[PDB]
């Protein structure tokens, strides 16, 4: 492939460099339309800019935490982190979010990796070996109330059991209701005067519940869960302007008030180098 | 001029005619047939009394009144005393059979009411006591009398609550079982052909009933003004393709 | 010795994975299969059998009576019953259809709603059933109702009427569990002319109503049902 | 590839792709045609 | 495959929507019999509703517990949980039970996964590493009396040894005596006047015995066993009405007295939306 | 039983590696794709569209 | 070699090697030739 | 393989059920030598009683 | 596939499928026919 | 290095499984078999030989 062809002096009536940008086109002008060039080859394919590659590496999408401790006398397991739960979503952390929102609709399979590490912040004789159980609780299915409810039987709901310190990995097909996931949605769930605006209403994915299977030892053990997400088989439509201001909320476009100028001011003139 | 409506079933030395039928159901779309060798286990040649057992026995009649809750019969129990069918039953170790069930209830074009006639394979009843109380033998072997769902709880008997099918499931879903309605305005009989359904090729006829026939009023009986407020319901049932095997001394069963 | 590397996920137990295992009983011979009528292969086979809907839900303890929709003689213009179409909740919820839908997260497809009339043979009636697609409110009078999917039913010799709620939807799947965005409409029924009883007859007549799914139907993404739970393991 | 000798040890079965609701939805003895009258 | 064909106005003598439900049939009526439709395709196969899929994921079927402690002076090992035992059964926990009882007879191979985790509720210097030994004690074979009986030799009885914290997995062929397992049985074991009713008499599967192989350390260690069961090669006959009331017992259909109405009462009229 | 040896790196999680995984939802059927104008395949496709430069940065 | 049955479980996809910026860079209704005048 | 063949009434001079155990043999008598039987197949091979299986765990 | 060189290292043997009880059930010198008299 | 994943059950010992193992005595030559009357192949062969029943159990 040639990156530049050889081109010499020109004295024409045919001027490729004068255009009318009002038309909305970006005319494909090249170095050889306005200087004299020599042949050179590309030596490159643009492999690593493919959208599959761009969205295809694992990104941290969520960090939660649960603890193993005596539940005796706990009136609210959920509240004691005896078993946390996460409202699956993909905009809670921002590195990956800005990347996805370069597109309007996106379609892909997900590969999740879940790393779990334990901490024992206060005096323990040892490090126990805990097994985590993460359940998929899609919307419409009983959601766990205690850390050892009938729910955890999970007879119809996919669940994975792995050890703290290890990693769990599995992959979920594209579960969207439509043909693509909306990265943006300028609508409501119905014509209500006070219903919420955004995608929050569309990206109804349900939540995922984690717990330790082990009963309690004499000390307490903090287990912190990190969920990583990798898109595989990516398809993206309609590019948009990149995010400039900071994010404030999952699912709304809102930016913070009295934010700071995002364009760097010159130290000098327009004329400055 | 054949209508879905008029029918004749002749089986053995007995015939039934209905002039107001609503087709007939054949459970799971299969018609009763004898036991093939490829499916056989017991090495004994079986006995097939044919026409002496495969005829129509009419059980004693019930009375549908505005307060009726529904009735339940078990097979082969209901027939335990009918003619030679019954003798064969007590005298062989094993037996197998399909049936034609014909439920009858006629009224006039001023009455309203609708019965559900359903056959439930393996209808294990529940104790009204709860917990793990069992349902004694006698209670699940009412004979031709069947069980009257509007009778009182008894001790060691089953629960007789209709919205729960006598087992913890809702009346509304009984329609997943082969069934037919008798709607006075349409229908006057219900006919169901039952093929033999079991997890073994042949079984004992006394320790295990393999279907319960259930007739349940769903739209209450409503008679014309100053009519007598009740109608009789009659059940006639015929064993079909019956086979008995392992003949001997003659079972003695509780009560 | 062949060189290997183990990946993330090694040693995990995923209740949904499908692999080979050693048999604990090497060489054992299972009992022969015999033929049994009734084999089921797909849950899609059974949700096409219709079952009764306790439409008359207004009672206070479960009763045979909540399966009966009453009809009044001589009323004109008025409304017989109304319900939204959240098949995973409300009237639908205990029906076989409702009961299976609850094992899945998403459903799509047409529903078949039929009404069987049980009044005396010498009576007559004309009813209108209307399906209102998502976007409008439950109709408030027949005029409103009749502008959407509807069937004038003429009560006759043929006892049942089968109304289909054709799949009307932007999004190709809806959640079973009540979602707004994903909502399916309303179903109402009104007198078209009116029920008329013959002489010597009196009182209310009832309709029985069934629901089953058309061959159209799709259910996906299995999950656990809210319809059953427990507090301690059972024992014998 | 089965690594094991016994059939019980193989993975899950593969979709019936059988599907025939008529034993449940139309177990009537005389065939009913849609469109023809139910009761003649 | 078409999901709907195109159909237009109709003015016929041929009415597919009038039927007689008294017959017991559900006539196959479609949208196109009563409105005007357009062609649409199914795009779907019904894969995930196959009974193999429905019953084919692991469900928790049993949680038991045994402890490792000094048996010195224990008069009843079984009673000290020096080795518990489980009367194999598949209706003790209900999520999977309701699923199976949608059918009358069911036939399948089982794949068992056994997860074992340890707990040290009171002061230990460390976490020991215990090996569990689960034995299959079918009916007719000596059942263990102490945690270290000749029984555990298990010379003819399949047994698996795995480590606490790990998982054991093996698969057992369909061991039923008949052609299918009865999900229901309206019979007795014989015509006795007082014999038990139900399947309890039919589902004679024997029990499975667990113990720790390790002798005791200075502290005590609680090991809790969870048995998961996955049906593979499923065959199911005769569908039944789903379970509506709660369960009370393994193997009987009995429901609790003064249970609550299972059908939700309307907040409003029959006419309400 | 086939003899193996594990190499350095076993058990690591590299966010950039690309391998197979078990599907948590065996047999599930995704929604059909419909056509949507605008598909992007390479970031190289979009950086050829011109956009305005805030050249007058002096504010 | 796929070891798994479902398509979601396969590794990353392989390069589009599609690449056609004209839907974005030249969505004009009447075709513009470089070198010819922009507005005639 | 048949487990039992079909066999009917017999009135013979050929009695397979009378033997002399003093000989040391176990004569191979079957159900069909003394009752009327119907055909049935074995459906079984005797796999799990092979001595390799018996001593092999 | 055997991964090992020695025969002892291979898995269990496979069913004799030999089966001949006559060395045990009928070790008589003169053949006895069922149905013929035992002692002539 | 070929990528692997280990499944549930790894490391377990099931007394009934049947796999290959290294021989501790590489290259050893077992004693030749000679003929011995009486070989048994199936327990089904022997349960067809009749034996006496202590029917008179009353002692
Ligand atoms: C055990 C176990 C646990 C699980 C989880 C199953 C995965 C379900 C999650 C499905 C994917 O979720 C989303 C959510 C949001 C988006 C998304 N939001 C927009 C910004 C873009 O994409 C995409 C996928 O499965 N088995
Ligand atoms: C070591 C070790 C441990 C074991 C256990 C062997 C498995 C034996 C269990 C056999 C399957 O048990 C049942 C019990 C009940 C039912 C059943 N009951 C009804 C509701 C439906 O199915 C099915 C299988 O094997 N090796």
JSON list of N, CA and C in Angstrom, two decimals, chain B residues 74-100:
[
{"chain": "B", "resi": 74, "resn": "UNK", "atom": "N", "xyz": [-61.25, -42.91, 42.21]},
{"chain": "B", "resi": 74, "resn": "UNK", "atom": "CA", "xyz": [-59.89, -43.40, 41.83]},
{"chain": "B", "resi": 74, "resn": "UNK", "atom": "C", "xyz": [-60.05, -44.66, 41.00]},
{"chain": "B", "resi": 75, "resn": "UNK", "atom": "N", "xyz": [-59.17, -44.94, 40.05]},
{"chain": "B", "resi": 75, "resn": "UNK", "atom": "CA", "xyz": [-59.19, -46.16, 39.19]},
{"chain": "B", "resi": 75, "resn": "UNK", "atom": "C", "xyz": [-57.89, -46.94, 39.43]},
{"chain": "B", "resi": 76, "resn": "UNK", "atom": "N", "xyz": [-57.90, -48.26, 39.51]},
{"chain": "B", "resi": 76, "resn": "UNK", "atom": "CA", "xyz": [-59.06, -49.10, 39.34]},
{"chain": "B", "resi": 76, "resn": "UNK", "atom": "C", "xyz": [-59.99, -49.23, 40.50]},
{"chain": "B", "resi": 77, "resn": "UNK", "atom": "N", "xyz": [-59.83, -48.54, 41.60]},
{"chain": "B", "resi": 77, "resn": "UNK", "atom": "CA", "xyz": [-60.65, -48.69, 42.81]},
{"chain": "B", "resi": 77, "resn": "UNK", "atom": "C", "xyz": [-62.17, -48.67, 42.56]},
{"chain": "B", "resi": 78, "resn": "UNK", "atom": "N", "xyz": [-62.67, -47.58, 42.00]},
{"chain": "B", "resi": 78, "resn": "UNK", "atom": "CA", "xyz": [-64.05, -47.44, 41.70]},
{"chain": "B", "resi": 78, "resn": "UNK", "atom": "C", "xyz": [-64.59, -48.73, 41.15]},
{"chain": "B", "resi": 79, "resn": "UNK", "atom": "N", "xyz": [-63.84, -49.52, 40.45]},
{"chain": "B", "resi": 79, "resn": "UNK", "atom": "CA", "xyz": [-64.43, -50.74, 39.87]},
{"chain": "B", "resi": 79, "resn": "UNK", "atom": "C", "xyz": [-64.13, -51.97, 40.68]},
{"chain": "B", "resi": 80, "resn": "UNK", "atom": "N", "xyz": [-63.53, -51.96, 41.81]},
{"chain": "B", "resi": 80, "resn": "UNK", "atom": "CA", "xyz": [-63.06, -53.07, 42.65]},
{"chain": "B", "resi": 80, "resn": "UNK", "atom": "C", "xyz": [-64.12, -54.09, 42.91]},
{"chain": "B", "resi": 81, "resn": "UNK", "atom": "N", "xyz": [-65.36, -53.77, 42.76]},
{"chain": "B", "resi": 81, "resn": "UNK", "atom": "CA", "xyz": [-66.48, -54.65, 42.93]},
{"chain": "B", "resi": 81, "resn": "UNK", "atom": "C", "xyz": [-67.34, -54.87, 41.74]},
{"chain": "B", "resi": 82, "resn": "UNK", "atom": "N", "xyz": [-66.98, -54.48, 40.54]},
{"chain": "B", "resi": 82, "resn": "UNK", "atom": "CA", "xyz": [-67.85, -54.66, 39.40]},
{"chain": "B", "resi": 82, "resn": "UNK", "atom": "C", "xyz": [-67.55, -55.99, 38.74]},
{"chain": "B", "resi": 83, "resn": "UNK", "atom": "N", "xyz": [-68.51, -56.85, 38.83]},
{"chain": "B", "resi": 83, "resn": "UNK", "atom": "CA", "xyz": [-68.58, -58.12, 38.07]},
{"chain": "B", "resi": 83, "resn": "UNK", "atom": "C", "xyz": [-67.27, -58.86, 38.09]},
{"chain": "B", "resi": 84, "resn": "UNK", "atom": "N", "xyz": [-66.93, -59.45, 36.95]},
{"chain": "B", "resi": 84, "resn": "UNK", "atom": "CA", "xyz": [-65.67, -60.22, 36.88]},
{"chain": "B", "resi": 84, "resn": "UNK", "atom": "C", "xyz": [-64.45, -59.33, 36.83]},
{"chain": "B", "resi": 85, "resn": "UNK", "atom": "N", "xyz": [-64.60, -58.03, 36.57]},
{"chain": "B", "resi": 85, "resn": "UNK", "atom": "CA", "xyz": [-63.42, -57.13, 36.53]},
{"chain": "B", "resi": 85, "resn": "UNK", "atom": "C", "xyz": [-62.81, -57.21, 37.93]},
{"chain": "B", "resi": 86, "resn": "UNK", "atom": "N", "xyz": [-63.66, -56.90, 38.88]},
{"chain": "B", "resi": 86, "resn": "UNK", "atom": "CA", "xyz": [-63.28, -56.95, 40.27]},
{"chain": "B", "resi": 86, "resn": "UNK", "atom": "C", "xyz": [-62.73, -58.25, 40.72]},
{"chain": "B", "resi": 87, "resn": "UNK", "atom": "N", "xyz": [-63.24, -59.37, 40.33]},
{"chain": "B", "resi": 87, "resn": "UNK", "atom": "CA", "xyz": [-62.74, -60.66, 40.86]},
{"chain": "B", "resi": 87, "resn": "UNK", "atom": "C", "xyz": [-61.28, -60.83, 40.44]},
{"chain": "B", "resi": 88, "resn": "UNK", "atom": "N", "xyz": [-61.08, -60.60, 39.16]},
{"chain": "B", "resi": 88, "resn": "UNK", "atom": "CA", "xyz": [-59.77, -60.74, 38.48]},
{"chain": "B", "resi": 88, "resn": "UNK", "atom": "C", "xyz": [-58.76, -59.90, 39.25]},
{"chain": "B", "resi": 89, "resn": "UNK", "atom": "N", "xyz": [-59.22, -58.71, 39.60]},
{"chain": "B", "resi": 89, "resn": "UNK", "atom": "CA", "xyz": [-58.45, -57.72, 40.33]},
{"chain": "B", "resi": 89, "resn": "UNK", "atom": "C", "xyz": [-57.92, -58.26, 41.61]},
{"chain": "B", "resi": 90, "resn": "UNK", "atom": "N", "xyz": [-58.75, -58.88, 42.45]},
{"chain": "B", "resi": 90, "resn": "UNK", "atom": "CA", "xyz": [-58.33, -59.40, 43.75]},
{"chain": "B", "resi": 90, "resn": "UNK", "atom": "C", "xyz": [-57.56, -60.69, 43.68]},
{"chain": "B", "resi": 91, "resn": "UNK", "atom": "N", "xyz": [-57.76, -61.45, 42.63]},
{"chain": "B", "resi": 91, "resn": "UNK", "atom": "CA", "xyz": [-57.17, -62.72, 42.38]},
{"chain": "B", "resi": 91, "resn": "UNK", "atom": "C", "xyz": [-55.85, -62.61, 41.64]},
{"chain": "B", "resi": 92, "resn": "UNK", "atom": "N", "xyz": [-55.45, -61.65, 40.85]},
{"chain": "B", "resi": 92, "resn": "UNK", "atom": "CA", "xyz": [-54.08, -61.70, 40.30]},
{"chain": "B", "resi": 92, "resn": "UNK", "atom": "C", "xyz": [-53.17, -60.74, 41.03]},
{"chain": "B", "resi": 93, "resn": "UNK", "atom": "N", "xyz": [-51.94, -61.05, 41.08]},
{"chain": "B", "resi": 93, "resn": "UNK", "atom": "CA", "xyz": [-50.85, -60.28, 41.61]},
{"chain": "B", "resi": 93, "resn": "UNK", "atom": "C", "xyz": [-50.66, -58.97, 40.86]},
{"chain": "B", "resi": 94, "resn": "UNK", "atom": "N", "xyz": [-50.88, -58.91, 39.60]},
{"chain": "B", "resi": 94, "resn": "UNK", "atom": "CA", "xyz": [-50.63, -57.72, 38.76]},
{"chain": "B", "resi": 94, "resn": "UNK", "atom": "C", "xyz": [-51.69, -57.55, 37.74]},
{"chain": "B", "resi": 95, "resn": "UNK", "atom": "N", "xyz": [-51.96, -56.40, 37.24]},
{"chain": "B", "resi": 95, "resn": "UNK", "atom": "CA", "xyz": [-53.08, -56.33, 36.19]},
{"chain": "B", "resi": 95, "resn": "UNK", "atom": "C", "xyz": [-52.77, -54.99, 35.50]},
{"chain": "B", "resi": 96, "resn": "UNK", "atom": "N", "xyz": [-53.44, -54.71, 34.44]},
{"chain": "B", "resi": 96, "resn": "UNK", "atom": "CA", "xyz": [-53.15, -53.39, 33.73]},
{"chain": "B", "resi": 96, "resn": "UNK", "atom": "C", "xyz": [-54.39, -53.07, 32.94]},
{"chain": "B", "resi": 97, "resn": "UNK", "atom": "N", "xyz": [-54.74, -51.78, 32.78]},
{"chain": "B", "resi": 97, "resn": "UNK", "atom": "CA", "xyz": [-55.98, -51.50, 32.03]},
{"chain": "B", "resi": 97, "resn": "UNK", "atom": "C", "xyz": [-56.10, -50.09, 31.55]},
{"chain": "B", "resi": 98, "resn": "UNK", "atom": "N", "xyz": [-56.85, -49.79, 30.54]},
{"chain": "B", "resi": 98, "resn": "UNK", "atom": "CA", "xyz": [-57.14, -48.43, 30.07]},
{"chain": "B", "resi": 98, "resn": "UNK", "atom": "C", "xyz": [-58.65, -48.31, 30.33]},
{"chain": "B", "resi": 99, "resn": "UNK", "atom": "N", "xyz": [-59.30, -47.17, 30.12]},
{"chain": "B", "resi": 99, "resn": "UNK", "atom": "CA", "xyz": [-60.74, -47.11, 30.36]},
{"chain": "B", "resi": 99, "resn": "UNK", "atom": "C", "xyz": [-61.41, -46.15, 29.40]},
{"chain": "B", "resi": 100, "resn": "UNK", "atom": "N", "xyz": [-62.71, -46.30, 29.19]},
{"chain": "B", "resi": 100, "resn": "UNK", "atom": "CA", "xyz": [-63.50, -45.26, 28.56]},
{"chain": "B", "resi": 100, "resn": "UNK", "atom": "C", "xyz": [-64.38, -44.69, 29.70]}
]
